[PDB]
């Protein structure tokens with residue numbers, strides 16, 4: 129039993145809710161919140177900008193030190209950093225950004241990072257300002273992630289479409 133509340137069950141291991149991931153993280157304080165990161169960990173907008181703002185920019189400060197030491201992530205890759213006031217840990221995962229021309233096949237590699245964590249609160253990778261089809265992102269998630277994932281979808285219209293079209 130865990131503390132996630134109000135989710136619709138899509139599969140054995142995938143759950144979904146119309147929610148603001150920032151507000152959901154503040155309430156649940158999950159072990160892991162996933163950030164929709166880019167390779168530079170520049171958290172300017174979308175989910176990343178929202179999560180960083182909620183940490184009062186501490187996420188960005190920590191991220192800048194990470195990049196200065198380690199260099200950029202790979203598209204499809206991830207790193208574990210602090211969750212600050214939102215979670216124990218933040219798993220920064222880089223989905224392909226269609227608006228940069230990145231290969232959508234890398235979306236599966238991105239979701240594979242979730243399998244290193246037993247339970248996660250997450251957004252749909254590559255959705256929103258990353259330009260992929262969220263219906264496709266949900267399908268890849270369900271077909272790739274085997275650990276327990278609680279998906280927060282900010283847009284109610286999109287949430288209803290994701291549920292109604294789910295096979």
Ligand SMILES: C[C@@H]1CN(c2ncnc3[nH]c4ccccc4c23)C[C@@H](CO)O1
Pocket residue numbers: 147148149150173174175178251252253254255256257258280281282283
């Ligand atoms: C695939 C993404 C998912 N994004 C979200 N998902 C869940 N909670 C969220 N809170 C936010 C606050 C500000 C901006 C974005 C979000 C957001 C929306 C959109 C952004 O590119 O597309």
